[PDB]
Design an enzyme around this catalytic site. Structure first.
Site, PDB file in Angstrom:
ATOM      1  N   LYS A   1      -8.328 -26.343  16.693  1.00  0.00           N
ATOM      2  CA  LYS A   1      -7.065 -26.548  17.424  1.00  0.00           C
ATOM      3  C   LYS A   1      -7.007 -27.543  18.586  1.00  0.00           C
ATOM      4  O   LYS A   1      -5.967 -28.148  18.904  1.00  0.00           O
ATOM      5  CB  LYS A   1      -6.526 -25.187  17.967  1.00  0.00           C
TER       6      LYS A   1
ATOM      7  N   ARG B   1     -23.483 -28.743   9.318  1.00  0.00           N
ATOM      8  CA  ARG B   1     -23.077 -30.011   8.736  1.00  0.00           C
ATOM      9  C   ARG B   1     -21.716 -30.353   9.333  1.00  0.00           C
ATOM     10  O   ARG B   1     -20.956 -29.442   9.648  1.00  0.00           O
ATOM     11  CB  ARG B   1     -22.999 -29.884   7.229  1.00  0.00           C
TER      12      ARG B   1
ATOM     13  N   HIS C   1     -29.679 -36.712   7.217  1.00  0.00           N
ATOM     14  CA  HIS C   1     -29.687 -35.459   6.484  1.00  0.00           C
ATOM     15  C   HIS C   1     -31.177 -35.218   6.243  1.00  0.00           C
ATOM     16  O   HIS C   1     -31.619 -35.275   5.091  1.00  0.00           O
ATOM     17  CB  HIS C   1     -28.922 -35.593   5.150  1.00  0.00           C
TER      18      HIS C   1
ATOM     19  N   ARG D   1     -23.653 -27.086  -2.285  1.00  0.00           N
ATOM     20  CA  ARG D   1     -24.996 -27.197  -2.796  1.00  0.00           C
ATOM     21  C   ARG D   1     -25.953 -27.229  -1.611  1.00  0.00           C
ATOM     22  O   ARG D   1     -27.075 -26.781  -1.781  1.00  0.00           O
ATOM     23  CB  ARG D   1     -25.178 -28.470  -3.601  1.00  0.00           C
ATOM     24  N   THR D   2     -25.639 -27.761  -0.428  1.00  0.00           N
ATOM     25  CA  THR D   2     -26.590 -27.742   0.686  1.00  0.00           C
ATOM     26  C   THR D   2     -26.575 -26.366   1.319  1.00  0.00           C
ATOM     27  O   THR D   2     -27.563 -25.914   1.902  1.00  0.00           O
ATOM     28  CB  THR D   2     -26.218 -28.822   1.753  1.00  0.00           C
TER      29      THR D   2
END
Ligand SMILES: [Zn+2]
Ligand SMILES: [Zn+2]
Lengths: 310, 146, 146, 310, 310, 310
Positions: free
Chosen positions: D84, D105, D134, D54-55
């Site tokens: 890795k 994010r 956020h 959704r973001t």
């Protein structure tokens, strides 16, 4: 106003012959003279709640060949939205605010139909719910039997395979049943034969059909030969092998076949059509798949345009 | 015919052990006023059938054809103005909304805020009921288990 | 007091918009005979409360204390032999079987063929109801949403 | 030069009232008259090291509505890079050479802040580190309480839910605390109440606030009602159910509510706001989500433009 | 007949002081003079629908030290039974026919209690349902505070940790509340303190208790010090670290401690008890765990024996 | 020498009526007077290359009730042996050296039969290969219809369900076809009916059989009613529901039923037998499952004994 502007295209029996005719005629057209920046500036969502990349790469190129932008997802149980508890209704309610058209495949049936109730003005194209509709495939199956046979009427059209659970052959019959004449030949294992609600429908509009054991008794009469896979689990390990080979099509069988005759397959095949058929001029499944671009473009243009200028 | 108030909508003659069910599915208790529920009596053209009147309501013509696949034959004779001025009896509608559940386990209607809706067919022989959402046509006896 | 048959168990005075619910949870319609359902009238010590008689039944003393957390005050006065020979009124029982649902989402009783059973407590102040199975004591108002 | 050109927008308390005011005023503007090819030719990275679609669908449409191109990834423990052993520092060091703005994010905190140290001239927009910032959500929360209340000052604003761990309500309070008047009402379970470092801050700038047990005692005074989920695991199976229902909002409660009053929710909801609220005119969470497009566009345009010509 | 023969031991408040006293006295006994072929020929089921190997290896050795045979399973979403759709009721209904005693751990609560309804004559020992009972642990906690303090009454007993969700300290308090005198000291983070239904119970039987901030103010008065883990997610990343260290027990703190005093821990620890405590004579968690054998043996012998001859 | 000593019991048509009679008579016996240390000191392998815990807990208790020891495994793609590349032949070749009898379930067919070629003197009991044999189930199905009907001949025995792929009803028919009289009633959905190679076999030995649409037309004639699940995927979402309810057995239908009549089910059921049948005296599936102990014990004793002394 177009007859399809703002329409959600969810089923094939949601459509009428005349706009099936408007979808096909338009496809023939955009194929002829492409319109690269027609949907320029529109943003479209590729919501594949159920992954399927062959339907996705097709749809997504189709948006792009008309200049549209794409945002979206292939979910495989990890997409935060429409997952943790957020209802598919409430996912569509927030996607519907930033895109201009939703494209959607999902595992449960009537998912796209549910989307239609929450998208508002946003059109919803159904890339396949579950066991129910996938009208975009059917709109590229008819565009191909007509691009090659020159007509969608009074044709001989065979239907080979798993005809019981084969939703792709179910819905090709209903759409071809809106046209006249048209003979049908269903070749199927005794146990996976064509469900008798379709056969019921076929009789009320008075459509001609037979039932056969092999493509051996059908080949000289046949215009289209729509092929489809017979699953190992649907029959019985032994019953599978006894009957199996009548449903395989090597090129050996393409001997009596008419010149027009086309072998179409929804794909992916595995082994029921052999590699020596691919060379033969009757093999048209790879082109059938290429035309899916043209049929899916047409829905995108009619749905997002009033004044379609082509 | 049992003791009941002048004026309301009279619902009558409900079949063998329905009636509580009809008060359950169409939600007839939410909209209050005297709900003369008869039930488990002898009545008209029967002599062992359920029935029940209400006060102040006035079910529509489509509101009464909803009963159709549950009773068919069942009077709903209004006691208008002061007394029994307007007879009725349901046939079978064109679309049964809410109430019934899709027998397809994989329908999205079990998971959602959506109203259940089946298009009705076959006037008699074996009334078929296709889902709005998953487009599957089941027999009515099959959806009617619930 | 409204029109009803001599002999049966009379249930009376049910509170504001219960009554249909009581016919729903204790399953009083399964065991047939004339079910004089009153409902949405004015009645005793109220003048706006629900009520309903039945014929041929005879609820037990424990059968009537089941009503307790739904009505308390509610007559259930038998019309024995020929007429109203035996008054009653529920208090609060020691164990409410079936009917209510555990609010603990992780209880095994949502997944099983087991009868729901809550031990009752607090005669008044805030009647607490612990689960038989997960041993969690919730308020009664909380289980009573269902 | 813009006040935000080349700036990495990482926190909400990294910003000042005056550029919060420049973000909001710009959003109102691009919403009015769109600028479709503003960022034409810029390439932006959607680095969601932590999936969240959704973001992501929001951010990615926002890049596209300004004509930018997007390359990126939703990682779910499988992306070769920054996995890795390759440090997140060294991943940003090679992404920073082919893109023009990173969107990011990640699960760990200060990730975007670390990116800022290796991106060089490339701006970094923080789509959410972990438990920390956020700011893009907050910049669409304020744009919505102002698009509807007509001002970001001297308002009554309720805060319902898990206020302890609820980072979205933490940071909406700090940003609204840069404005004047503004009353605050915190409705929370005894055990998940508003952390007292915020309450400390609220007292030093002299901001008015109360504490309540339910939306029942708050509803006629309230302008905004910012709703948020109370998690089952945070309370106690029994303590959850006793208090639960005071934090649910069905439309029954919307009786005393003022005409202006808006019910906002960060989403996804589950059940603490009921479907009969969606019909009521005070429900504005779906529109709150739509405006996120406008607030995120604004950061992209200010950050990648000096001469913003709108 | 034994007072526990054929009994399903599901809760600790299902038992009375007098058979808690019969469980303990028997354990002390079998520890003294072992009975290796007591349960010879009995077959017992180790049903761990929820894996947990420390409870399982304990239970299973206990069956074996009495000569019993074991069949069973550690399920981790793959055991065909009590999985695909087969109700846990119907799983117990077929296990109950070939075993002589079921041992059972499960994720949902009242699972063992449900088993009791379908096992018939077969006793059910509850190795822990969910958030609810694990009486076998409590029966080895009391056997250990009594093997070391010489009595289960008029003792000072501290309770350190996550006391809200800590079911192991909940149920140790209820069982010790059936005995006289007994002081209680609860040291807990402000937010994870002892639930007040237990504190309510403690006041009605008139039991003495305090509340403390650290083991610093408790150490010279304390007989038992029952330690338990404070989870990082239950507090707040910052609130966790400020208070954290008051709940750690290094041996530095064992300075004022009485000679009798025992440090017990349910295990697994991680870091709230330090390795320099293990050397100190007050460390008794490893022995607490060893005695679990003796307490679980006792239930198996009382439950499957009438004439217990020891 | 026993007629079954050292024999690998792999199929039901590998056996003859006379040793099927020796398996049954022995089971009746060990059930009567148990032999707890008969197989004392023998070590048996529970090789479940395919997990299935209901067959495993049964088999493993059966070894133990005769005093044998068990080593083994439930593999779920992680057991080092008979996995990485090591052939199932070479796995049996090293197991066969330390055990005395192998018990074995596997996904591919003829697996146990392959084991027989490499075990040498070691007997192999087949706990079910794939789609092929599971003779131990059949040996507990016949032991139960005879423990209750008092005979394995001239009986009416119904067969309900998925009779096409239902291997458990296939092989119960072949074994009952070695006995005389015996009527058969097959109730099955049109599309999942009894395969016609069995019906062919039934006609050559002259066995009587019918075909029915529901248990409604069969109930007063029926001695056994062997019930089995009809899978949703095998029919068609709609075709499933129309016919579904004729194959469910609630106790309502147990009205005409004879007194002897027994309702048996291989398990696990889901919903085709309802909970009000469990109370009725005709419900015998839970006891059918309990007797599996007795039938599997018998094979273990005959196979590992010459001089069977019971
Ligand atoms: Zn449906
Ligand atoms: Zn419970």
């Amino acid at each position: 106003a177009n007859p399809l502007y703002q329409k959600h295209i969810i089923s094939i029996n949601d459509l009428s012959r005349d706009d099936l005719n408007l979808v096909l005629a338009t496809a023939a057209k955009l194929k002829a003279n492409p319109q690269p920046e027609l949907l320029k500036h529109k943003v479209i969502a590729s919501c594949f709640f159920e992954a399927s990349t062959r339907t996705r790469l097709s749809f997504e190129t189709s948006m792009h060949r008309l200049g549209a932008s794409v945002v979206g997802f292939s979910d495989s149980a990890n997409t935060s939205l429409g997952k943790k508890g957020e209802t598919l209704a409430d996912t569509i309610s927030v996607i519907s605010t930033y895109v201009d058209a939703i494209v959607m495949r999902h595992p449960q049936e009537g998912a796209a139909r549910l989307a239609t109730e929450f998208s508002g003005n946003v059109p919803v194209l159904n890339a396949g719910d579950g066991s129910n509709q996938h009208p975009t495939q059917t709109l590229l199956d008819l565009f191909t039997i007509q691009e090659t046979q020159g007509r969608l009427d009074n044709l001989h059209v065979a239907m080979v395979g798993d005809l019981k659970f084969g939703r792709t052959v179910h819905s090709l019959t209903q759409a071809l049943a809106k046209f006249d004449g048209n003979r049908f030949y269903f070749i199927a294992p005794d146990a996976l034969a064509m469900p008798q609600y379709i056969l019921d429908m076929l009789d009320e509009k008075g459509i001609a059909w037979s039932l056969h054991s092999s493509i051996e008794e059908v080949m000289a009469e046949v215009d289209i030969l729509y092929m489809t896979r017979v699953q190992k689990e649907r029959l019985d390990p032994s019953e599978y092998a006894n009957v199996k080979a009548q449903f395989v099509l090597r090129a050996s069988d393409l001997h009596n076949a008419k010149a027009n005759m086309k072998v179409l397959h929804p794909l992916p095949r595995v082994d029921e059509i052999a590699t020596d058929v691919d060379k033969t001029p009757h093999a048209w499944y790879f082109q059938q798949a290429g035309n899916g671009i043209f049929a899916r473009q047409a829905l995108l243009a009619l749905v997002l345009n009033r004044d379609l200028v082509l | 015919q049992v003791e009941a108030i002048k004026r309301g909508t009279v619902i009558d003659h409900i079949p063998a052990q329905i009636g509580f069910k009809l008060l359950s599915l169409f939600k007839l208790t939410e909209t209050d006023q005297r709900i003369t529920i008869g039930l488990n009596l002898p009545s008209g053209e029967m002599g062992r059938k359920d029935l029940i009147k209400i006060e102040n309501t006035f079910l529509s013509e489509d509101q009464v054809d909803q009963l159709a696949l549950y009773a068919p034959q069942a009077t709903v004779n209004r006691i208008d103005n002061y007394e029994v001025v307007g007879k009725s009896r349901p046939s079978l509608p064109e679309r049964i909304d809410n109430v019934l559940v899709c027998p397809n386990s994989n329908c999205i209607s079990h998971a959602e805020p959506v109203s259940s809706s089946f298009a009705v067919r076959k006037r008699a022989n074996d009334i078929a009921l296709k889902c709005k959402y998953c487009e599957k046509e089941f027999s009515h006896n099959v959806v009617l288990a619930n």
